[PDB]
Scaffold this active site. Structure first.
Site, PDB file in Angstrom:
ATOM      1  N   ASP A 127      32.777  59.903  14.550  1.00 48.06           N
ATOM      2  CA  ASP A 127      32.427  58.568  13.650  1.00 48.06           C
ATOM      3  C   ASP A 127      33.572  58.095  12.962  1.00 48.06           C
ATOM      4  OD1 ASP A 127      31.624  56.147  12.772  1.00 48.06           O
ATOM      5  OD2 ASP A 127      29.709  57.268  11.470  1.00 48.06           O
ATOM      6  N   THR A 155      32.874  49.232  14.238  1.00 50.24           N
ATOM      7  CA  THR A 155      33.849  49.209  13.107  1.00 50.24           C
ATOM      8  C   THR A 155      35.218  49.735  13.506  1.00 50.24           C
ATOM      9  OG1 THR A 155      33.419  51.167  12.136  1.00 50.24           O
ATOM     10  CG2 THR A 155      32.069  49.371  11.254  1.00 50.24           C
ATOM     11  N   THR A 156      35.116  50.791  14.587  1.00 51.34           N
ATOM     12  CA  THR A 156      36.563  51.309  15.197  1.00 51.34           C
ATOM     13  C   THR A 156      37.190  50.310  15.909  1.00 51.34           C
ATOM     14  OG1 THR A 156      35.074  52.342  16.918  1.00 51.34           O
ATOM     15  CG2 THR A 156      35.573  53.740  14.930  1.00 51.34           C
ATOM     16  N   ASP A 161      20.870  53.354  13.515  1.00 51.17           N
ATOM     17  CA  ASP A 161      21.800  52.259  14.056  1.00 51.17           C
ATOM     18  C   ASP A 161      21.197  51.821  15.333  1.00 51.17           C
ATOM     19  OD1 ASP A 161      23.559  54.378  12.791  1.00 51.17           O
ATOM     20  OD2 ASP A 161      24.864  52.634  12.903  1.00 51.17           O
TER      21      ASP A 161
END
Length: 505
Positions: free
Chosen positions: A43, A76-77, A369
């Site tokens: 993550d 987000t990555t 999520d």
């Protein structure tokens, strides 16, 4: 020196560590501190919170990254890995005597132009077609590593978010609670209407099943009462020992009388219970638990309709809760209490089991999520085929729009288009196949009147239809990530004044 390059280069070093973690079978690193605690996680948000930074200008990118974590979670990555490419291409622009202002104007114009494009590519779906909600679930679960019990886990999540659909067509993530507990295996996951209380009764003489049980919210330690002032009670005579301790117990019967007369049936104490008090509630037949943290008293109150009560010497019937069944069975040794309400289940709870503590932890982070990525689709009803295919379509049409803009601005516009092809490149090296070669074939599918769902498959390794396989994502994970990248890139091109201040507060 001006030290202007040290800023753009500081962010690239942070992207290389996360660029390798993007993908289904992407490896991870371990930058453990000087303590010794070893840990690894696939993550991008877990490493940033623990990763240390040496320069002060390497913090704005982390703060903005946490904004999307509390909205969608995943994606987000993809924003931090693409932002590093704009900084690398910017170095080539500075060589040609180009001011950063001209580069910032291109990203703002290109970012807004990509908004109307995604709205037209997105298709429409129904608000109840379960077949559509099944593919969107496995698309994100298979990437985390769960090729064992995925065909059934997706059905337990789609049925939970669909039952908490209010009249205004919205879904909440707080109403869904999660509980971790090692057991037989992962296949033990089952949907439950009520909420669970990981506690065991202190007497097996309680009713096995009771209908229409009124909850009695308690907020007082069931123990001997003592004056707040400093004044103890000295016992000496053999006769005075059955008064100060007995009269206090009689108050419990008087208290239970008012609670029993109000139609009560169960009880939940926030704190522990005295050892001697467990004998009366068992011989007389009184259901009551011990130690209920604040995290549980809240969900158990609003769900069952009960309200917080501070004074117990006036627990009227209007303050009590409401439920349908209160059963307590035993499974895998330990037992758990059930609190369901068939009249109006306003909340749900999904229990997860595993063999090792590490398994129950990883799966616990994906259930929170999965309910969010699907919640936005039920409210909006629009999805776009992902799988590294959305950015490929933008790199073909945006090139034609650059011809319209003249002057020294078209250089920055094209720089943003050729920087989006890096996402599928990382997926290629992760699978062990060449990238520069396959990129020539992917463009053939998007020549002109070709399909718009062609993407790379890490499993088979050939271009196929990403729509039939089950690779699809909403339209908010893309527009938000691209918009966040442009909003964060200006933080590196606009800054310049870096005076060494002292005591700035």
């Amino acid at each position: 020196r001006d030290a202007q390059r040290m800023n753009i280069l500081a962010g690239r070093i942070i992207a290389e560590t996360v660029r390798s973690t993007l993908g289904p079978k992407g490896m991870d690193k371990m930058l453990v501190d000087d303590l010794g605690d070893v840990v690894v996680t696939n993550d991008g948000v877990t490493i940033l919170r623990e990763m240390s930074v040496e320069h002060p200008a390497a913090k704005m990118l982390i703060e903005v990254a946490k904004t999307q974590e509390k909205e969608v979670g995943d994606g987000t990555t993809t924003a931090v890995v693409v932002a590093g490419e704009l900084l690398r291409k910017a170095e080539e622009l500075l060589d040609q005597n180009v001011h950063p202002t001209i580069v910032v104007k291109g990203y703002q114009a290109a970012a807004q132009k990509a908004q109307e494009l995604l709205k037209t590519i997105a298709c429409e779906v129904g608000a109840q077609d379960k077949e559509i909600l099944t593919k969107i679930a496995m698309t994100s679960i298979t990437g985390k590593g769960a090729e064992k019990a995925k065909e059934k886990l997706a059905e337990i999540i789609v049925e939970a978010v669909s039952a908490v659909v209010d009249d205004e067509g919205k879904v909440d993530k707080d109403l869904i609670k999660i509980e971790k507990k090692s057991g037989a295996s992962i296949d033990d996951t089952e949907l439950i209407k009520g909420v669970l209380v990981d506690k065991e009764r202190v007497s097996a003489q309680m009713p096995k099943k009771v209908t229409d049980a009124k909850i009695a919210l308690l907020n007082c330690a069931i123990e001997i009462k003592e004056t707040e002032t400093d004044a103890e009670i000295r016992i000496t005579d053999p006769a005075k020992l059955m008064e100060f301790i007995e009269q206090e117990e009689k108050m419990l019967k008087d208290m239970v009388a008012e609670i029993k007369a109000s139609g009560a049936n169960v009880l939940f104490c926030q704190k522990g219970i005295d050892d001697l008090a467990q004998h009366y509630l068992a011989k007389e037949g009184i259901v009551a638990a011990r130690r209920v943290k604040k995290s549980d008293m809240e969900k158990l109150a609003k769900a069952t309709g009960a309200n917080v009560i501070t004074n117990i010497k006036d627990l009227s019937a209007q303050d009590l809760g409401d439920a349908g069944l209160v059963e307590e069975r035993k499974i895998s040794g330990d037992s758990m209490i059930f609190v369901e309400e068939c009249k109006h289940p306003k909340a749900v709870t999904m229990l997860i089991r595993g063999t090792t503590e590490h398994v129950i932890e990883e799966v616990a982070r994906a259930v929170d999520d999965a309910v969010g990525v699907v919640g936005c689709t039920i409210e909006d009803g629009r999805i776009v085929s992902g799988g590294g295919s959305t950015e490929v379509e933008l790199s073909m049409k945006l090139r034609e729009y650059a011809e319209g803009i003249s002057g020294r601005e078209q250089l920055a516009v094209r720089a943003f288009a050729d920087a989006l092809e890096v996402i599928p490149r990382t997926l290629a090296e992760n699978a062990g196949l060449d990238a520069i070669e396959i990129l020539v074939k992917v463009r053939a599918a998007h020549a002109s009147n070709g399909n718009k769902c062609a993407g790379l498959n890490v499993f088979t390794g050939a271009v196929e239809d990403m729509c039939e396989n089950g690779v699809v994502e909403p339209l908010r994970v893309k527009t938000q990530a691209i918009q966040s990248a442009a909003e964060s890139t200006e933080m590196l091109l606009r800054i310049d004044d870096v005076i060494a201040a002292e005591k700035l507060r």
